[PDB]
Write an enzyme that holds these catalytic residues in place. Structure first.
Site, PDB file in Angstrom:
ATOM      1  CG  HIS A   1      73.276  50.090  84.298  1.00  0.00           C
ATOM      2  ND1 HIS A   1      72.325  50.372  85.256  1.00  0.00           N
ATOM      3  CD2 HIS A   1      72.588  49.573  83.240  1.00  0.00           C
ATOM      4  CE1 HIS A   1      71.117  50.073  84.782  1.00  0.00           C
ATOM      5  NE2 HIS A   1      71.240  49.572  83.540  1.00  0.00           N
ATOM      6  CG  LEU A   2      78.632  53.966  79.923  1.00  0.00           C
ATOM      7  CD1 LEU A   2      77.806  55.192  79.539  1.00  0.00           C
ATOM      8  CD2 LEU A   2      80.131  54.259  79.921  1.00  0.00           C
TER       9      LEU A   2
ATOM     10  CG  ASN B   1      68.514  53.339  80.042  1.00  0.00           C
ATOM     11  OD1 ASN B   1      68.710  54.086  79.087  1.00  0.00           O
ATOM     12  ND2 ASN B   1      68.419  52.032  79.894  1.00  0.00           N
TER      13      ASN B   1
ATOM     14  CG  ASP C   1      72.938  43.610  79.069  1.00  0.00           C
ATOM     15  OD1 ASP C   1      72.007  42.766  79.064  1.00  0.00           O
ATOM     16  OD2 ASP C   1      72.774  44.786  79.465  1.00  0.00           O
TER      17      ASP C   1
ATOM     18  N   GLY D   1      63.713  54.013  81.106  1.00  0.00           N
ATOM     19  CA  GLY D   1      63.852  52.554  80.930  1.00  0.00           C
ATOM     20  C   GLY D   1      64.896  51.938  81.861  1.00  0.00           C
TER      21      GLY D   1
END
Lengths: 121, 118
Positions: A107-108, A94, A38, A100
């Site tokens: 995506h995990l 999410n 990330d 959010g």
């Protein structure tokens, strides 16, 4: 403050990462997913596992996507073991505004390397 | 003291209907029910009927079952009126906050969820 425009089916930065048009620290790839760190990490280890297929939101995933979505989780746990998250981790998906969701591409999240807290936001 | 990984859990009691739970959905593979210590106006779990102790020990062939948890999750969220969104969580181990060693997907909604996710 009022006006909004959205293109859920449209390209996203995660598309650009999959196409290698912009860089990311890639952890794992196969024919159907990509795992990468990330760029705004919220834990000492924070990466994403995303499908190559552009499913915009888990709420619009189809029944025939179950194998693929499970594949995200298996890839996520394997990557977590290889990155040494032996004291544990949290996986997160999410959905929408209350969830959010930052990007219209499923995506995990996998977070670890610190104590994660409760509630999870 | 210390329920060890591999031991039964409360979820076995809920599956066998030995204690009361508010059950949302049940099929041959999984069960969804409301969490009894909710952290949002809607807070439910989706669990496999197969005893998987911890996501770290899921096998490759469990792919479709884990996927099925997310699909049932999203169906149940829609049926419960979560049209503004929700958050799905799976915890592993101590840093994840897990003490109940049976895989369980949380679904939370009905409020703004914040970042980071704990």
């Amino acid at each position: 403050a009022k006006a909004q425009v959205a293109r859920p089916g449209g390209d996203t930065i995660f598309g650009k990462i999959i196409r290698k048009e912009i860089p990311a620290k890639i952890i794992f790839e196969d024919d159907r997913c990509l795992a990468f760190h990330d760029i705004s990490p919220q834990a000492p280890t924070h990466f994403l596992v995303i499908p190559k297929k552009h499913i915009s939101q888990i709420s619009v995933a189809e029944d025939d996507d179950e194998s693929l979505l499970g594949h995200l989780m298996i890839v996520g746990k394997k990557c977590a073991a290889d990155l040494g998250l032996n004291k544990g981790y949290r996986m997160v998906v999410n959905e929408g505004s209350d969830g959010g969701q930052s990007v219209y591409h499923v995506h995990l999240h996998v977070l670890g390397g610190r104590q994660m807290h409760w509630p999870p936001g």
